[PDB]
């Protein structure tokens, strides 16, 4: 146990080829409760055209996070650090 | 103000590659946060060739840390929210 302190009081991409929207993620139990996480618009991504292009893909750019997770259950004082996988944004791949 | 107690205890194909820079910070947790860096000015063709006709641009998000306060402590700190470079994009200009 590595218990610290902390105080809670704190003091575009549109033109993208493989671009994305957000997606509200909440829960409870965590701290921050609402994560926003971006969700490709296209399985492809956009040609010169403005077309999809299918032989490529828009894949989410996912990336650990750490957290705030309560503990014990519902406590609204006590943490546990936790690390979470998240969506935060979308890049072009050529496929395998 | 708002005190609670938190346990420590825990895309190579892009045509917009990028690179990861390890950035410290002593007077924040985490003080290690791998940061992106793109490659490139341009984006990769179809040819496997940088392309000025494309921008890869970084994705910049906003994340929770924590920033030591008072400073230097080990123990004692507040919630900050900082801007961090999570991978880059291919742009249209």
Redesign the interface.
Same mark, same amino acid.
């Given at each position: 146990?590595? +218990?610290?302190?902390?105080? @809670?009081?704190?003091?575009y991409?549109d033109?993208?080829?493989?671009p994305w929207n957000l997606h509200r993620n909440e829960d409870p139990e965590r701290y921050?409760s609402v994560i926003w996480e971006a969700k490709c618009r296209h399985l492809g991504?956009?040609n010169?055209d403005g077309n999809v292009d299918y032989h490529?893909n828009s894949?989410p750019?996912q990336?650990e996070?750490?957290?705030?997770r309560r503990?014990p259950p519902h406590s609204?004082?006590?943490?546990? @650090?936790?690390?979470i996988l998240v969506s935060?944004?979308? +890049?072009?791949? +050529?496929?395998?």
């Open positions: 146990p590595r +218990t610290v302190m902390v105080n @809670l009081n704190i003091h991409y033109r993208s080829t493989s921050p991504c956009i010169a490529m894949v750019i990336q996070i750490l957290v705030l503990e609204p004082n006590s943490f546990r @650090l936790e690390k935060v944004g979308c +890049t072009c791949v +050529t496929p395998i």
